[PDB]
Amino acid sequence: GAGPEMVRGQVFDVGPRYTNLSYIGEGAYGMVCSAYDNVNKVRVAIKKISPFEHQTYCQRTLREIKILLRFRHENIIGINDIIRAPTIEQMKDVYIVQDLMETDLYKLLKTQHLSNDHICYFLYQILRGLKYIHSANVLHRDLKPSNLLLNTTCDLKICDFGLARVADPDHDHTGFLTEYVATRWYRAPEIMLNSKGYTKSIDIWSVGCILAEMLSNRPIFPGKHYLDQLNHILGILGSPSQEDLNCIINLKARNYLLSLPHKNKVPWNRLFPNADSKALDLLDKMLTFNPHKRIEVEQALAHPYLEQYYDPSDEPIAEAPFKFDDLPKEKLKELIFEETARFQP
Numbered sequence: 001g002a003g004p005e006m007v008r009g010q011v012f013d014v015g016p017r018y019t020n021l022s023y024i025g026e027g028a029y030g031m032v033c034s035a036y037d038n039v040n041k042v043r044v045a046i047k048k049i050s051p052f053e054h055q056t057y058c059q060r061t062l063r064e065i066k067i068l069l070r071f072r073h074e075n076i077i078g079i080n081d082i083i084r085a086p087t088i089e090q091m092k093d094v095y096i097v098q099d100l101m102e103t104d105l106y107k108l109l110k111t112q113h114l115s116n117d118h119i120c121y122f123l124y125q126i127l128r129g130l131k132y133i134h135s136a137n138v139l140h141r142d143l144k145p146s147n148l149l150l151n152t153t154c155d156l157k158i159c160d161f162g163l164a165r166v167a168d169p170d171h172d173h174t175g176f177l178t179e180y181v182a183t184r185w186y187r188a189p190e191i192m193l194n195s196k197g198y199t200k201s202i203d204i205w206s207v208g209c210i211l212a213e214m215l216s217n218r219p220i221f222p223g224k225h226y227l228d229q230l231n232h233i234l235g236i237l238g239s240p241s242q243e244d245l246n247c248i249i250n251l252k253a254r255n256y257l258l259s260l261p262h263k264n265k266v267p268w269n270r271l272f273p274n275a276d277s278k279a280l281d282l283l284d285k286m287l288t289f290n291p292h293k294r295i296e297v298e299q300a301l302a303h304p305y306l307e308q309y310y311d312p313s314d315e316p317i318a319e320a321p322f323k324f325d326d327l328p329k330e331k332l333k334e335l336i337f338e339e340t341a342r343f344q345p
């Protein structure tokens, strides 16, 4: 009647509830499959995580689980179930069960032209989800096409909160060329200059990059290394203004920028000659050099480009902000145990 199913060598140890597994994808995180859920009689996504190796994997696993279990929003992927062993001793893998989707925006953009109506709907759903995330004082910190799931009718859900943080604007300042973890092409210029990425404006940048990418099917700032990223950004925005430069108090960052030859702004309408002019106005406001002047998520939702969809009464916010590293291996494993206990018999 049963006996562990397997996919591409991996044990997939999720029965008897979930059967008829089929491979979907793989990555550093581990392996995602589709599976038939014998209780809800629908196929689901299931990902196998095996993080008890180093405490960075456990950290990303804890953020993912705590954040997704607390959030409840149409444009954010949920967690439906979590499978692990009944004891901490016996627990080696964690399986996380989620709604099955058709594709993601990365896969779709590599193959498919988006109509302006698709671009607009996708952007609306991205911002609607992000409004909820930011309302909970959380930053996603790794928005990119691969982290946007789409079902067969183009409903969009933000996924992967493994790099999320609680916002902390008072502690955002740092030095020049301070190392960073989130995905290079979607990093706002201030990351390379003086920002730890602890402000909501980090995410708006990333969304801006996504919007550009939906317009041309090409990443807008495809830098090949840390500082190369800034140089792509400045190649298009042009040299920052005196005022914007004056806002960078850190001398190493400020003097770097002063060292560069003047560069002119590339007009959006020349980069995206097929784009809706309202789209390019919002793009401009999202890809603003100076993070203080960068448009916020609720202003973005109110922008004329999104007028067909905007309805703040149907753009919900979180009930309460989050306020949940210095924690040993053993304690991180215990917390993953405790957090997943609600799904055990």
Ligand SMILES: O=C(Nc1ccc2[nH]nc(-c3ccncc3)c2c1)[C@@H]1CCN(CC(=O)N2CCN(c3ccc(-c4ncccn4)cc3)CC2)C1
Residues within 6 Å of the ligand: 024, 025, 028, 029, 030, 032, 045, 047, 049, 050, 051, 053, 057, 058, 060, 061, 062, 064, 065, 077, 096, 098, 099, 100, 101, 102, 103, 104, 149, 159, 160, 161, 162, 163
């Ligand atoms: O949520 C995720 N995937 C996902 C979910 C639901 C879905 N429904 N439908 C789909 C779908 C259907 C068809 N085509 C494409 C997609 C789908 C995909 C991804 C997989 C992983 N997840 C992040 C996550 O689970 N985190 C916790 C674990 N973290 C982690 C843990 C261990 C390692 C690691 N690395 C190296 C060695 C060992 N462990 C790395 C990251 C990363 C964040 C984002």
